């Protein structure tokens, strides 16, 4: 039984897409199939951001952010709860979960 119309990946009008290595297990996964997650977050967590403020030498020093792009294989994405199973019709929904 076919489960997904796009076969679980974003490859439509090409033959081969270069693989990439999973962030957790380093498994080879096609770039179009990898569950991607561009993580932007402050270098200092919200708990410690206050301490760094009065520890700083600058009057108004904005905390730099951390930009990490994660690529996940299907097993690691499911295991790490990045994605979950969905129902027959819930699978077809493509909009990202609300902020």
Q: Does residue 86 bind RNA (CB under 7 A)?
A: no
DSSP secondary structure code for residue 39 in this structure: E
Place of tokens 């730099």: 64
CA distances in angstroms from 2 to 6, 10, 13, 88, listed in the order given: 10, 16, 19, 12
Q: Does residue 76 bind Zn ion (CB under 5 A)?
A: yes
Specify the residue, 51 or 93, whose C-beta has the smaller distance to RNA.
Answer: 93
CA dist 95 and 99 (Å) reads 11
Q: How many chain residues are in contact with RNA, going by CB under 7 A?
A: 27
The least CB distance from residue 34 to Zn ion, in Å, is 9
Q: Using CB under 5 A as the criterion, which residues of the chain lie in contact with Zn ion when the complex forms?
A: 22, 24-25, 27, 73, 76
Q: Using CB under 5 A as the criterion, which residues of the chain lie in contact with Mg ion when the complex forms?
A: 2, 33
């Amino acid at each position: 039984t076919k489960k997904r119309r796009n076969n679980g990946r974003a490859k439509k009008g090409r033959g081969h897409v270069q693989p990439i290595r999973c962030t957790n297990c380093a498994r080879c996964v096609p770039k179009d199939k990898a569950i991607k997650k561009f993580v932007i977050r402050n270098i200092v967590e919200a708990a410690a951001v206050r301490d760094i403020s009065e520890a700083s030498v600058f009057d108004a020093y904005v905390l730099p952010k951390l930009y990490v792009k994660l690529h996940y294989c299907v097993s690691c994405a499911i295991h790490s709860k990045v994605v979950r199973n969905r129902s027959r019709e819930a699978r077809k929904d493509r909009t990202p979960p609300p902020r």
